[model samples]
Target: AECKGFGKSCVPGKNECCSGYACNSRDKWCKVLL
Candidate 1:
C-alpha cells in the first residue's frame, strides 16, 4: 500500500509521507522530475 513502496502514489526520494501527513515537494521537484 501507501507505506509499502512500489507502484504507489509517491516515490522514496521523489516524494513520500510521514506520520499522518502527506509528502509535499515545495521546490517544484515534481514539476521538473515528475
Candidate 2:
C-alpha cells in the first residue's frame, strides 16, 4: 500500500508515512517531520 500523508493514520517505523512525514508515537498519526 502507498504511504500515508500528513494528518493521516500511520504505524511508526513501518514505512506507513510518506516523504517529509512520520508517524507520531502518541497519536499514531502522520505528521511533518521537517
Candidate 3:
C-alpha cells in the first residue's frame, strides 16, 4: 500500500504515513513528527 505524506488526510489505524510523518488524531491529517 502507498504511504501518506505530510498534510495528507489520514485515518488512525487505517491509513499509514511515510517516514517522519504520522496521522494527527486531532486533525486526522498526516503531519511531520516534531
Candidate 4:
C-alpha cells in the first residue's frame, strides 16, 4: 500500500499496515540498518 499521512491502520509513529513495519508521518518506513 502507498504511504499516507495517517489512515485507518496508520499510526503517527508506528503501524505501516501494508508491510507490517513501523513508520512515521515524515518517514514512511524505517530502513534496515544493515
Top of the candidates by lDDT: 3
Order the numbered candidates by lDDT, best leading.
3, 2, 4, 1
For residues 1-34, write the lDDT of model 3, one tens digit per residue: 7898778888876658898887888898888889
lDDT of 4 by residue, 1-34 (tens): 5643323344455445444334444544443223
Model 2, C-alpha of 26: deviation from truth (Å)? 1.1
| Winner by TM-score between candidate 3 and candidate 1 | 3
User: Over 4 Å off in model 1, which ranges?
Assistant: 1-15, 27-34
Off by over 4 Å in 3: none
TM-score of each candidate?
A: 0.19, 0.72, 0.73, 0.18
Clashing pairs in 2: none
Clashing pairs in 4: none
Q: What is the C-alpha local distance difference test score of each model?
A: 0.37, 0.80, 0.83, 0.43
RMSD of each: 9.2, 1.1, 1.4, 6.9
Instruction: Provide the lowest-lDDT 10-residue window in model 4.
Output: 25-34
Q: Which portions of model 2 show Cα errors greater than 4 Å?
A: none
Clashing pairs in 3: none
